[PDB]
């Protein structure tokens, strides 16, 4: 149920930050699905990184390495 936990105004604000004037009504589900796929990939990488270190909590640090190994490096952490 947490997949629908993110809100349509949140997606609208995300598109506003991306310089989009107007948003079609059937693209919210597609954006949620592709966000789920991206989060699944990044979370799988972070889970493998956490399990390699004999750790049960996903720290911020291996998350930014999981993002950076995918060509999406994160700064500030």
């Amino acid at each position: 149920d947490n997949i629908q936990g993110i809100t349509k105004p949140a997606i609208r604000r995300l598109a506003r930050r991306g310089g989009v004037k107007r948003i079609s009504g059937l693209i919210y589900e597609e954006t949620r699905g592709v966000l789920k796929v991206f989060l699944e990939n990044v979370i799988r990488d972070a889970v493998t990184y956490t399990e390699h270190a004999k750790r049960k909590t996903v720290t911020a640090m291996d998350v930014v390495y999981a993002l950076k190994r995918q060509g999406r490096t994160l700064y500030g952490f």
């Binding site: 949140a10 598109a15 107007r22 948003i23 079609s24 693209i27 954006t31 979370i43």
Partner: protein, 96 residues
Amino acid sequence: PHRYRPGTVALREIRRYQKSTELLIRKLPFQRLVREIAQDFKTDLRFQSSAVMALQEASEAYLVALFEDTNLCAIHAKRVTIMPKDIQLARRIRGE
């Protein structure tokens, strides 16, 4: 009552969300989604607050870039609206 044309409020929202770097996605739904996704790979898995922040920032920046490419494709198709086919084309060119 006062009425605004379709677009000027959209342009104002674009401007006000591009000058500032506030967190558009709420903390709790994104955190709950992250826990739901991670619970299928590893049970009883914890997430520190800074990890959730970092993942939320990366996701928001990725979705903003994807929406930028989606709007770019929409303008290329002489269209103002953004359709799921635009997202599919942008991801296919980006190889996602």
